[PDB]
């Protein structure tokens, strides 16, 4: 990566809005973290709950559907870490809710395994499929922690 893209990715991760605004161009808004998993700025902003940065990147042409090296999209990151507002922003901008990574994990697998009831609910309202099996043969329901009976009920 050029130094500028590196700084952009770090700023997206840190939620440094002003630096994002300075460095975000048509050429860099969908740049990829080559030294790592080829995450985009939107992958970082989504995973680290940087809401202002997520909104800015989306407005400026960031690809909600962009897959990293593992086939994860920013929605996977938001759901894994319980960032409800970010998840809603991505979904409202057309994010595919049944998107599957290289291991066939979906956002619902993430939200279910991580005990995020409201995100599970959001995903289901948008057509997320609780019967989708990952590479291990596990559905999102299969991944729910024993104590999370509310999420079990929701997904069943």
């Amino acid at each position: 990566n050029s130094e500028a893209d590196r700084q952009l990715l770090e700023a997206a991760k840190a939620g440094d809005v002003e630096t994002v605004k300075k460095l975000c161009t048509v050429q860099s808004v969908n740049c990829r973290d080559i030294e790592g998993r080829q995450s985009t700025p939107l992958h970082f902003a989504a995973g680290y709950n940087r809401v202002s940065v997520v909104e800015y990147l989306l407005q400026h042409g960031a690809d909600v559907h962009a897959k990293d090296k593992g086939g994860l999209v920013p929605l996977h990151n938001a759901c894994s870490y319980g960032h409800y507002e970010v998840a809603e922003l991505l979904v409202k901008h057309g994010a595919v809710v049944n998107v599957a990574d290289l291991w066939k994990f979906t956002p619902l697998h993430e939200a279910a395994a991580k005990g995020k009831y409201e995100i599970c609910k959001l995903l289901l309202q948008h057509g997320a499929d609780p019967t989708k099996k990952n590479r291990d043969g596990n559905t999102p329901l299969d991944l729910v922690k024993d104590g999370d009976t509310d999420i079990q009920d929701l997904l069943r």
């Binding site: 970082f44 995973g47 680290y48 709950n49 994860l72 996977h76 990151n77 894994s80 994990f105």
Partner: peptide, 12 residues
Amino acid sequence: QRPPPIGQSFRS
């Protein structure tokens, strides 16, 4: 083997 996604739950 699937690594954890980029990100974290708590800002703190």
